[PDB]
Each structure stands twice: as structure tokens, then as C-alpha cells.
């Protein structure tokens, strides 16, 4: 499978998904994430289908490393190949947002990380960010571009985010541990599934 941007799958209004977080071949915890398809339909569907991992070239978040990590701020992942992609024949995802916007001020928010092409145009891919804290004077979450678009929230596993954040407390000369995504998937969306 691939999907078309012209004819988007529909995974539900609020798909829910999970991701194990792995460190040194051991699962340290599981994140459970509720998505807001009305924030950004194409970016939400790409996230959910990559979580399902059935799309083929197989495209999954499983095995992805957290490649940019910042104590008291965020973690970032999504290099599904090292590079990022999309379920839409790896087509860039346009910034076509839905009817609602979610502020980017709280701990455990999921967002998609923008990039700019050769013409200066904004696109999205599999690259995603999760916040480790709320905005406060002591961090730089208030500095994130509005284009760092919120598409979901963690509803289980904030304590796993805390473990990650503790382990990345900075010290000169200390390199961070390498976190990765383990098993991942979507929970059944019963409203979408019923017949």
C-alpha cells in the first residue's frame, strides 16, 4: 500500500496509538497518544499509518531513533529509513491544516516538524516532536515556530517522558543515551470499525 493526498484514508476523528520506548534493547515504557485528525488531516494520517507499519517500499516508526533531544524541552524522531518519508509514495505533505488549532504550551504534546524545500515552501513528513515539559521561563518551548504544528497529546506514559528527561540532564562531556521506538500500532477505532 501507499495512500493518496487527494483521497486520504480515514482512521477516525481521534485515532489512538501506542509506542514502546526502548533503551539498550530494553523497553523502558509505553507512550499512548491521542491524535486530533481535525488539526491536520494528511499529517495525522501519515503518522497513524506509519504507526501501523503495513505500508510498503515496509514503512514503520518501529526502530526509529530519537535523533534530537533537549532536556526540559522535547524529543524528536521519524527517520523511518537515515532519512524521513511519507506513506503517500514519499510525497511531501502540504501544510493543509484542518478546522482547529491546538496551542503548543503543554507537556506531552505531539507535533509534526516542518521543513523547507528549494523554493522556500513548507512541507511535513514522518518527523515528529513530543514535548517533555510545559512552557516555562527556564526552557525554550515558547521559541518554537507556529509551524511546529500540534496534532496530538500523550494520554498515557507521561512518566516515561519523565524518565527520558531525567536521563538527558546535561553535563559537559556526557553523551546522551540513544532512545528508540519499539513496537508500535494503533488501537481499534470502534466508531470507524463498526458495521
Which region, judged by CB under 5 A, interacts with Cl ion, from 43-51, 75-83, 100-108, 172-180?
Answer: 172-180
Q: Of 172 and 193, which has the nearer Cβ to Cl ion?
A: 172
Residue 171 is a binding residue for Cl ion (CB under 5 A): yes
Give me the half-sphere count of Cα atoms (radius 13 Å) on the Cβ side of residue 79.
9
Which region, judged by CB under 5 A, interacts with Cl ion, from 63-71, 95-103, 118-126, 141-149?
Answer: 141-149
Grid coordinates belonging to 13 = 476523528
Tell me the per-residue interface mask from 127 to 156 with a second copy, x by CB under 8 A, - otherwise: x-x----------x--xxx-xx--------
Least CB distance to Cl ion at residue 179 (A)? 19
Tell me the per-residue interface mask from 71 to 110 with a second copy, x by CB under 8 A, - otherwise: --xx-x--x-------------------------------
Residues 6+ apart with CB under 8 A from 96: 40, 41, 42
Residue 113 is a binding residue for a second copy (CB under 8 A): yes
**Size of interface with a second copy, in residues (CB under 8 A):** 33
Give the span between the Cα atoms of 106 and 190, in whole angstroms.
28
CB 167, CB 177: distance < 8 Å: yes
CB 3, CB 90: distance < 8 Å: no
Give the span between the Cα atoms of 66 and 88, in whole angstroms.
23
Residue 121, class by beta-carbon neighbours within 10 Å (0-12 exposed, 13-18 middle, 19+ buried)?
A: exposed
The residue within the footprint of a second copy, chosen from 175, 190, 193, 195 (CB under 8 A), is 175
Residues 6+ apart with CB under 8 A from 55: 1, 2, 3, 49, 87
Rule CB under 8 A: which residues touch a second copy? 28, 67-68, 70, 73-74, 76, 79, 113-120, 127, 129, 140, 143-145, 147-148, 163, 166-167, 169, 171-175
Amino acid at each position: 500500500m501507499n495512500y493518496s493526498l487527494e483521497d486520504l484514508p480515514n482512521s477516525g476523528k481521534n485515532p489512538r496509538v501506542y509506542m514502546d520506548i526502548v533503551l539498550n534493547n530494553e523497553i523502558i515504557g509505553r507512550l499512548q497518544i491521542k491524535l486530533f485528525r481535525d488539526a491536520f488531516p494528511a499529517g495525522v494520517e501519515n503518522f497513524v499509518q506509519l504507526t501501523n507499519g503495513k505500508t510498503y517500499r515496509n514503512r514503520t516508526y518501529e526502530g526509529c531513533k530519537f535523533h534530537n533531544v533537549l532536556h526540559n524541552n522535547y524529543i524528536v524522531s521519524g527517520d523511518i529509513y537515515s532519512s524521513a518519508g511519507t506513506v503517500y509514495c514519499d510525497e511531501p505533505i502540504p501544510p493543509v491544516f484542518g478546522d482547529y488549532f491546538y496551542p503548543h504550551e503543554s507537556k506531552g504534546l505531539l507535533s509534526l516538524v516542518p521543513y523547507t524545500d528549494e523554493s522556500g515552501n513548507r512541507y511535513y513528513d514522518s518527523t515528529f516532536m513530543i514535548t517533555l515539559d510545559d512552557i516555562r521561563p527556564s526552557n525554550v518551548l515558547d521559541e518554537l515556530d507556529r509551524d511546529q504544528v500540534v496534532i496530538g497529546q500523550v494520554y498515557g506514559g507521561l512518566d516515561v517522558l519523565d524518565k527520558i528527561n531525567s536521563m538527558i540532564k546535561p553535563y559537559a562531556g556526557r553523551k546522551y543515551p540513544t532512545f528508540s521506538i519499539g513496537k508500535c500500532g494503533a488501537y481499534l477505532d470502534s466508531s470507524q470499525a463498526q458495521r
